[PDB]
Amino acid sequence: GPSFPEPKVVRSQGGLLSLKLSATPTPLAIAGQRATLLTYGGSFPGPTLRVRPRDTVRLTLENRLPEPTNLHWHGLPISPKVDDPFLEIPPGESWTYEFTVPKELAGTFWYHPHLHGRVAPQLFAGLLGALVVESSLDAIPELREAEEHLLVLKDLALQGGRPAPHTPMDWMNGKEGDLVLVNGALRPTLVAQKATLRLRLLNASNARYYRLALQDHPLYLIAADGGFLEEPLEVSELLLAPGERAEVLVRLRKEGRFLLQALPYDRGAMGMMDMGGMAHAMPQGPSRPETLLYLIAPKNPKPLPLPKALSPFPTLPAPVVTRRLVLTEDMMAARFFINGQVFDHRRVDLKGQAQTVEVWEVENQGDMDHPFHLHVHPFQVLSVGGRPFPYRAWKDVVNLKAGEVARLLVPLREKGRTVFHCHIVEHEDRGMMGVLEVG
């Protein structure tokens, strides 16, 4: 097949993407070895759903797993009666998700389980896929003439031909795997045919971070989790925390082989050490550097000009309330808290007004990085750690290093009960989640 593997794409037809998707244990060939994963649509990653604004999505999820499951439409500003974090699909049963893609929307989104207490093993085992919302902006020459690829960044560990089980330490840290894969492939080769690449990036890992850097090249950020930037932003590297997405342009500068790497990054994961009366927690330190793929540039590359502008970011109304959410840890208990509480599905923690704007100050008082995710209501990151954000775009996950405060501008959209949680999904399963009600 193509040198660069990507998930099969399912496109809407006549304004309708109608698809049945089974969640099933699936024998596969993965990274040169045979293993049984949990998949949507028989593949790892699951199929990429490609839609346009105003399309209707009708996705029937059949649960063939031995435990209940559901779907989170991560990043989609739709109703939490559709993107329902409390719904349970029992084994053997099906549920049809039906929604209209919002008019003002573009970018890379994804789908995965969100059944509290069961997310981390199900996501680790392979249950995830991408959703791409096409935009009329994709027709501008500087994007249309680029070579486009999706990169699903997800790691894995295998034991006995199955996803490795979670250990106690995995529940504390979030589980990372030794197989650091792109689109389910081990260090694939991308032989570029054009000098400008448009790469849609998804961190679908439980806990692993990707400090992305392409050898000898900058990256041009053109979209964050939930939409385009106002104009391209040149960066030397790009950190993608669990759940985050980005889209970048790569302007290949000369012929040759260039490594796309996940550079060393210390997210605060912990181990245990005994040195005589010690028996205390000790930092794991930075991750070892990983090669993600090999990028082969074409002959005599002449990249396109970058687009001068992308999408103007909406002028938001003045906010009507300020929230403060504080994240803390009990590492040895593998318990994680928001404002001193663990998740309770019966307890509403915040009550807000639809079509108002709120300021959310999220403070990480733990020592680990925590990627904070809000369902249903995309936000604008104003600042993190006291540093202003260098661009305006919709996000739905924001990474907080130890001590950092993120200031978010949160327009409340659809009414109903939804959640916010750490997207180190082990921490969500272990309590780091709360309930927002919008009325």
Ligand SMILES: [Cu+2]
């Ligand atoms: Cu998610």
Ligand SMILES: [Cu+2]
């Ligand atoms: Cu969630």
Ligand SMILES: [Cu+2]
């Ligand atoms: Cu966390």
